[PDB]
């Protein structure tokens, strides 16, 4: 497996439009773009709202915010037993491919992950407030 | 009949047939000895 | 960013995963557990403190914790 | 995406906007605010006149009413000064721009207090 | 051969545990050596509705 | 000596009330605004 | 008398008290007939309220500047003057019943504790266990003692969950 | 063109005071008895919820008819 690339060109949903989609954050800080292969026509749900239909074969969408990407993601897998995928677009042109992370959803072990923020203690062995009192800055006692 | 039975022990309607007839004892009380405010 | 972390109490039953709304978490391989598998918070920058993997545990206590830190647009949800 | 109406897109609606001083490109800033200045100058006078505490009152009613909107206008035009400096400061159009705005801040004091003047010789 | 005979009833000693100095019956220890290997059930449920749990050898101790 | 002119009121009144304040106001603004190098 | 009280036989406002309650009734009794339904309601009102200033002037109570009777909750006091009856008596009446009713409640509970669903005894009454339960609650004064005695009223500390100090 | 007409099941459900003895019958997570007193009221906030006890079109039907 690696990285798939963006494909600007891809055709977009059937969609006529509505006030719930991007703003100017998308022209000055980032928007997520979405996409997917379909199987055939279909009504979906929009996380803007409304109802759009998928295209046969590629479809693209871009969204203001990565839970909406995610939303939909949900939605059609789970639905329609698809594989989606979105990535951050920033507005130099720069992409950055987010979900699935390696290529397999991250509820199902994959090797080659390394483990991130994980304590080797249970809540209950957390250290008192007053013993990292004066650390530089606010920190809770998790993390140490 | 048992299944009726046991309805009538559930715990509204026990609620109910209790403070029905502690009331009334109360009032009942009240009815033939008026205007109680101390012991004698 | 918010802070979450996974404690060693996880049983690797991935429900926290499933229930994230914004992908911050993912199973890896462990040897602590008998699934063999422990969560992971790779991507905290993403975490919007919804706090639905700690819903999701069933662990008694919490094994996935969110400490709710300093908020940047992602963290707060804005799509502005 | 976007959901378009006859009032978002419509060709008379977007050839007037382009014409207003705010959207007309080409011209100075200051120039653009003497503009935008008068036209808003000459207005605020009325309803201070009008209602005002002094409005029964025969001949002070127009001064106090348009010396009332004067004020009203540099209170304005402090307004537009802040906002240029909170707003610019690290592009097409220079109105937009740390220098263009306090131009154009400065022409919208003149414009407004021109437009207040210019409606109490009206009354009067 | 470690932990609890299943069956068996069990004083809960982890602190921070809903069921901390509560009774509950062993289910099943698991042998493989894993942290908390013993499994406990319990009449009442928690606040999130769970009546199960894991516990380390050294968290139960033999009822009564 | 200590007794203020009869015309104070008129002057400090409106000038801790409308002057000082848009003063106090814009330049707070500015302040809380302003980006850190 | 007892904090500058007077008793209420020898207040001239207590007196002053029932003239004035038999005298509002006396006024809507005159435009009924005699033998009519509201003539007869309003005439029983009024012998009520006779026997009621008769019944507490006889208690003894005693009665303030106003007129109306003011109860004494000192012990000492409401032994020394005769005046048991109005708190200090009906003080053990309360915390008989009332125990009565805790007592009962809670033999009903650890009855239930040992059955296969407890649950279900809580939401479904089992009323003849119940029953017996409220029957036998009239001796729960010298039961509670006995199990304060015998050790058994109260649980053990190890037995009793707490949250983390 | 379907015609109108009346239509009936007969007996759908008997009568019987079995289901009186048995709180929380109507749904299948309350069904179970309580463990804490939020299935108490949980019992009464979800009574008249039909649709929320199945999604048979008809059932639903016929208890909000008889309600
Ligand atoms: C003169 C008038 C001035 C009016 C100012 C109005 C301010 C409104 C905003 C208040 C607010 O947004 O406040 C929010 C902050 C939040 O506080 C802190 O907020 C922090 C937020 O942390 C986050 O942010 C931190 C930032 O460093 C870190 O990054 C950290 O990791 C991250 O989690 C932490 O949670 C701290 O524990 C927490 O204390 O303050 C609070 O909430 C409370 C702060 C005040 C405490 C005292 C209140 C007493 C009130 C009595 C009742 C009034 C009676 C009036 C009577 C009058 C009669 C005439
Ligand atoms: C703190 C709460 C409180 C208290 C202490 C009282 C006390 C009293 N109220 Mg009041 N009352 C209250 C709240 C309270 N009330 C409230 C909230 C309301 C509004 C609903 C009323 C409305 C009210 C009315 C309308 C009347 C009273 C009356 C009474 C008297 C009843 C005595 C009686 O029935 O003896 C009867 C004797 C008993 C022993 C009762 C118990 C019987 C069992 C079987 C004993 C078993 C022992 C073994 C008493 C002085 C009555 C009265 O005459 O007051 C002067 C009266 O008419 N109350
Ligand atoms: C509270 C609202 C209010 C009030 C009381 C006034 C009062 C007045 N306006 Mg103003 N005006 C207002 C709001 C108001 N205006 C607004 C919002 C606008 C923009 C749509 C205008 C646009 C306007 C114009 C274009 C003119 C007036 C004029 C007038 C005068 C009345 C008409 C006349 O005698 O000639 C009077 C000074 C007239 C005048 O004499 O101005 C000096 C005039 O020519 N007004
Ligand atoms: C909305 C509520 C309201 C309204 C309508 C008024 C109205 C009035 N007040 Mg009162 N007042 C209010 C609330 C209000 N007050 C409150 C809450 C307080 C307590 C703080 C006071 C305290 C107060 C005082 C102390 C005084 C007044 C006075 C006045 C009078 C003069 C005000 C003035 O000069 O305005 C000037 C108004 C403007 C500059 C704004 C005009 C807005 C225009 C008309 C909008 C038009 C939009 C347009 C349609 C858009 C077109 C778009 C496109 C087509 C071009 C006037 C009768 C004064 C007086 O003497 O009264 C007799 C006076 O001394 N008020
Ligand atoms: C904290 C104390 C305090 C408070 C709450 C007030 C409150 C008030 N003062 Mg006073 N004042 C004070 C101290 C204070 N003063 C002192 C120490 C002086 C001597 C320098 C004055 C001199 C003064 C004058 C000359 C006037 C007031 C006036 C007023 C009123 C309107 C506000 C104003 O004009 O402030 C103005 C405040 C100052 C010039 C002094 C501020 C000093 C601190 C350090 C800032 C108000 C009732 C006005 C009044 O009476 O209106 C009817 C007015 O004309 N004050
Ligand atoms: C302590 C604060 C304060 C002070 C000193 C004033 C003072 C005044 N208010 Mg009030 N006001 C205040 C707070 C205050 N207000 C607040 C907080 C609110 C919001 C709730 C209001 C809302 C309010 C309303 C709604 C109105 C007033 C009005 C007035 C005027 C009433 C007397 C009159 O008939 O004027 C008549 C007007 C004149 C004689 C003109 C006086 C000079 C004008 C205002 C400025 C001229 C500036 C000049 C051209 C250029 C700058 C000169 C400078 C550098 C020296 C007066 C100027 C009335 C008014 O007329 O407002 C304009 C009025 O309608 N006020
Ligand atoms: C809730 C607290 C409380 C308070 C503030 C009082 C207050 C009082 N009590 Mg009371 N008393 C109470 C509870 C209380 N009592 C209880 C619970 C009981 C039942 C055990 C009694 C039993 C009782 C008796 C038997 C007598 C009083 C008496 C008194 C009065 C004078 C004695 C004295 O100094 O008492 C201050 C109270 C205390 C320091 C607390 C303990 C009081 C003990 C129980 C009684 C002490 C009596 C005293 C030695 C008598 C001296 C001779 C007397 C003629 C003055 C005084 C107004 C006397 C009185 O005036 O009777 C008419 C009296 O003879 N009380
Ligand atoms: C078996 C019944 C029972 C008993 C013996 C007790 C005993 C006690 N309660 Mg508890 N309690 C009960 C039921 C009971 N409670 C119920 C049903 C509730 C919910 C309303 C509460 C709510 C409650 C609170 C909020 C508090 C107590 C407190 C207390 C303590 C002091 C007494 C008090 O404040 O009573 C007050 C009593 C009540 C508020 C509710 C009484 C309701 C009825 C009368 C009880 C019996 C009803 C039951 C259905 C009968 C079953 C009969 C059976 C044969 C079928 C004491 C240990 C206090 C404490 O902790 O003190 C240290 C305290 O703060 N109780
Ligand atoms: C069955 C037979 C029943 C007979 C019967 O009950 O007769 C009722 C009896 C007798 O009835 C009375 O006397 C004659 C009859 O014997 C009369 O004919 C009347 O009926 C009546 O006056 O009355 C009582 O038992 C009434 C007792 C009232 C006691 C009230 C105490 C109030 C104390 C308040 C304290 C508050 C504490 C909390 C405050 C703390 C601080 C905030
Ligand atoms: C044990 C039986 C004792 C009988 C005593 C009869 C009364 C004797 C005269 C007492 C006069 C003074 O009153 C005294 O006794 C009262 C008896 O209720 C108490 O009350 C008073 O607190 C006490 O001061
Ligand atoms: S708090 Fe919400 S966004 Fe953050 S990890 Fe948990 S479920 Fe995901
Ligand atoms: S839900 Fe809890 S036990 Fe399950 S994988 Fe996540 S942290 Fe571990």
Redesign the interface.
């Known amino acids: 497996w690696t990285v798939p690339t963006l494909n600007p060109d891809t055709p977009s949903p059937i969609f006529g439009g509505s006030t719930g989609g991007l703003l100017r954050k998308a022209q000055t800080e980032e928007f997520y773009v979405i996409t997917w292969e379909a199987k055939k026509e279909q009504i979906f749900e929009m996380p803007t709202g409304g109802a759009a239909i998928m295209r046969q074969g590629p479809n693209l969408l871009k969204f203001g915010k990565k839970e909406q990407c995610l939303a939909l993601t949900t939605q059609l897998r789970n639905k329609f037993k698809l594989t989606p995928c979105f990535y951050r677009v920033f507005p130099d042109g720069k992409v950055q491919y987010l979900h699935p992370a390696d290529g397999v959803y991250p509820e199902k072990v994959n090797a080659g992950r390394v483990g991130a923020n994980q304590n080797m203690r249970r809540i209950g062995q957390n250290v008192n407030p007053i013993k990292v009192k004066f650390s530089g800055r606010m920190m809770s006692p998790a993390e140490i | 009949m048992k299944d009726f039975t046991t309805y009538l022990s559930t715990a509204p309607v026990i609620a109910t047939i209790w403070f029905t007839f502690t009331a009334g004892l109360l009032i009942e009380i009240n009815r033939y000895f008026p205007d109680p405010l101390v012991f004698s | 960013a918010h802070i979450v972390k996974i404690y060693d109490t996880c049983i690797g039953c991935t429900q926290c995963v499933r229930a994230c709304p914004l992908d911050v978490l993912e199973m890896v391989p462990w040897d602590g557990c008998k699934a063999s598998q422990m969560a992971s918070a790779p991507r905290t920058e993403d975490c919007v403190g919804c706090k639905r993997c700690e819903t999701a545990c069933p662990t008694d206590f919490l094994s996935v914790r969110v400490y709710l830190g300093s908020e940047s647009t992602r963290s707060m949800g804005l799509s502005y | 995406?976007?959901?378009?109406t006859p009032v978002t897109s419509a060709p008379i609606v977007a050839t007037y906007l382009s014409n207003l001083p705010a959207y007309r490109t080409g011209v100075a800033p200051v120039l653009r605010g003497v503009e935008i200045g008068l036209a808003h100058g000459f207005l605020l006078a009325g309803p201070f006149i009008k209602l005002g505490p002094l409005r029964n009152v025969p001949e002070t009613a127009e001064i106090a009413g348009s010396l009332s909107a004067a004020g009203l206008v540099l209170?304005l035009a402090?307004c537009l000064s802040?906002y240029g400096?909170?707003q610019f400061?690290?592009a097409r159009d220079p109105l937009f721009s740390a220098d263009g705005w306090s131009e154009f801040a400065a022409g919208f004091l003149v414009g407004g207090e021109a437009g207040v003047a210019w409606a109490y010789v009206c009354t009067q | 051969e470690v932990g609890p005979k299943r069956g068996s009833l069990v004083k809960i000693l982890r602190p921070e545990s809903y069921w901390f100095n509560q009774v509950g019956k062993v289910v099943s220890v698991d042998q493989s050596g894993v942290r908390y290997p013993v499994v406990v059930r319990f009449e009442n449920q928690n606040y999130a509705g769970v009546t199960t749990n894991n516990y380390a050898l050294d968290e139960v101790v033999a009822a009564k | 000596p200590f007794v203020p002119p009869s015309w104070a009121p008129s002057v400090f009144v409106p000038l801790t009330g409308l002057v000082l304040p848009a003063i106090a106001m814009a330049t707070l603004f500015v302040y809380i605004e302003k980006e850190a190098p | 008398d007892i904090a500058g009280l007077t008793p209420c036989s020898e207040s001239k406002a207590y007196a002053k008290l029932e003239k004035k309650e038999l005298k509002t009734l006396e006024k809507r009794l005159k435009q009924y007939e005699a033998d009519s339904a509201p003539a007869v309601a309003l005439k029983a009102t009024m012998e009520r309220t006779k026997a009621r200033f008769a019944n507490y002037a006889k208690a003894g109570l005693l009665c303030g500047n106003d007129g109306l009777p003011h109860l004494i909750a000192d012990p000492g006091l409401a032994l020394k003057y005769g005046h048991a009856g109005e708190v200090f008596i009906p003080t053990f009446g309360f915390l008989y019943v009332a125990g009565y009713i805790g007592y009962v409640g809670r033999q009903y509970l650890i009855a239930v504790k040992g059955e296969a669903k407890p649950t279900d005894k809580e939401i479904i009454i089992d009323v003849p266990l119940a029953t017996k339960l409220a029957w036998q609650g009239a001796g729960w004064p010298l039961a509670a003692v006995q199990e304060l005695q015998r050790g058994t009223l109260l649980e053990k500390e190890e037995n009793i969950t707490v949250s983390p100090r | 063109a379907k015609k109108v007409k009346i239509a009936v099941d007969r007996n759908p459900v008997e009568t019987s005071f079995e289901k009186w003895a048995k709180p929380g019958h109507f749904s299948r997570t309350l069904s179970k008895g309580p463990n804490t007193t939020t299935w108490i009221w949980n019992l009464h906030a979800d009574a008249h919820d039909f649709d929320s006890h199945t999604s048979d079109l008809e059932e639903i039907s016929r208890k909000v008819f008889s309600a």
């Open positions: 995406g976007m959901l378009e209170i402090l802040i400096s909170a400061q690290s």
